[PDB]
Design a protein around this ligand. Sequence first.
Ligand SMILES: O=P(O)(O)Cc1cccc2cccnc12
Ligand SMILES: [Zn+2]
Ligand SMILES: [Zn+2]
Length: 229
Amino acid sequence: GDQRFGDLVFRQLAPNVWQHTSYLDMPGFGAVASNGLIVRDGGRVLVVDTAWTDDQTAQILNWIKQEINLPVALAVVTHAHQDKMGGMDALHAAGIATYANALSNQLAPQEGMVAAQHSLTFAANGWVEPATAPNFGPLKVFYPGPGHTSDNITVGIDGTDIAFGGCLIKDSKAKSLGNLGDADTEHYAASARAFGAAFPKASMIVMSHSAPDSRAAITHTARMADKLR
Ligand SMILES: O=P(O)(O)Cc1cccc2cccnc12
Ligand SMILES: [Zn+2]
Ligand SMILES: [Zn+2]
């Protein structure tokens, strides 16, 4: 059930949940797909992650207008790399309230990103401080510890079997942990396992660079990360 919409791909995952996919021709790595989420919560839409670029992110909003036709109340982005935050200006131009881990917003300028408007902060156990995530509806935001990056955050969708690991989690057949340039290799395995423990009911694991998978994505990612230590 993939829907080609311009240069992007959209796939319904649940009655109120769709995955957005965008591509960037990155020299040395081919045309890399990146996934995020679109969630309808009653009369509004919530977005997880931008596309790689402003133009692609505007195209996500165009798809939302044509297929859902409800306002986008907010977006949350899951770390300060291009695939997750590269389209921040398009969200701001559209009047959408944007949220990121405080550390992502601090890192955004040096990473070439535009910061989100609002900062999420996290309790010692990883759960978002609820006052910093107002009106998130079914989105449950969890900081699992440093892994793919020090700022990576994850999102469960209450009322569904879906949890989103972003670039922390790779699929159950993945050959590597991908881009470790900003990774915490010592803590990766525990962070991947903490994501699994935060969302024990999630049987569909969504991630940045592979199609949705079973929880074997979590166990396999953690087992690969065991080897980094
Ligand atoms: O780490 P990601 O997935 O957020 C962004 C990304 C994806 C693929 C290859 C990369 C190479 C260098 C830097 N970033 C890359
Ligand atoms: Zn990244
Ligand atoms: Zn990635």
